[PDB]
């Protein structure tokens, strides 16, 4: 049913951009809150930026750790979520996941398998 | 920003014993509407995290009864009546009602004796 797949991460050089993507399957993509959580090989899960559904005018909020660099977006026709990351760095190397809110008080009801990024060579 | 501070860092248990993870916020985590978007997740070794309890105490469909959360305020606590081997992993509490949304540092739930 619900399928969330990420892709676009890889080995990048300090500074410089990259564009992550998440494909959707099994749900009217437009009616749901979406996010990007990040877990550096290190430890803790870290919410980066979130995008809401048509019901909420597709608003968007970001952590400050990516406030100006990273930028979220959503292809409502193709049902895909993107995360453009710019001037990457060290603390950026991590497995980036895709998440979709639940019809109730829940932000991450469905996570993707996650895609890894490594920046520091 | 309001950070979550969950303890203990590591929680050793024998399969079958109850387990209790705490999560002290650092300030009221009540949204403008009436909710407290405090959630729990279980990330098993090398495996995306799962949603366990969304509002301070609702149990996400598919998660077994063993799990339950609670305690509105600044102190929230996740409890598991009997811990199966498949419960072992790292639990994180997530604060979802105040931007910048935050996670706890986690609390590994490994086998004790």
């Amino acid at each position: 049913e619900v399928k969330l797949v990420e892709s676009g991460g890889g080995l990048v050089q300090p500074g410089g951009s990259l564009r992550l993507s998440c494909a959707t399957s099994g749900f009217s993509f437009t009616d749901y809150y979406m996010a990007w959580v990040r877990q550096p090989p290190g430890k803790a899960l870290e919410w980066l930026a979130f995008i809401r559904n048509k019901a909420n005018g597709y608003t968007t909020d970001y952590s400050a750790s990516v406030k100006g660099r990273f930028t979220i977006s959503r292809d409502n026709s193709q049902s895909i979520l993107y995360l453009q990351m710019n001037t990457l760095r060290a603390e950026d190397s991590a497995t980036y996941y895709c998440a979709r809110g639940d019809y109730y008080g829940a932000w991450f009801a469905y996570w993707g398998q996650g895609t890894l990024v490594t920046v520091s060579a | 920003q309001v950070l979550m501070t969950q303890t203990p860092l590591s929680l050793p248990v024998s399969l079958g014993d109850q387990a209790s993870i705490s999560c002290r916020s650092s300030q009221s985590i009540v949204h403008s509407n009436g909710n407290t978007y405090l959630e729990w997740y279980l990330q098993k070794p090398g495996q995306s995290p799962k949603l366990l309890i969304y509002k301070v105490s609702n149990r996400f469909s598919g998660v077994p009864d063993r799990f339950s959360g609670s305690g509105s305020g600044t102190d929230f606590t996740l409890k598991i009546s009997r811990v199966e081997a498949e419960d072992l992993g790292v639990y994180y509490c997530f604060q979802g009602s105040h931007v910048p949304y935050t996670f706890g540092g986690g609390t590994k739930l490994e086998i004790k004796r």
Binding site: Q13, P14, A121 | Q1
Partner: peptide, 9 residues
């Protein structure tokens, strides 16, 4: 490195 390469709110 390869080619051509309190305080809380």
């Amino acid at each position: 490195s390869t080619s051509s390469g309190g305080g809380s709110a």
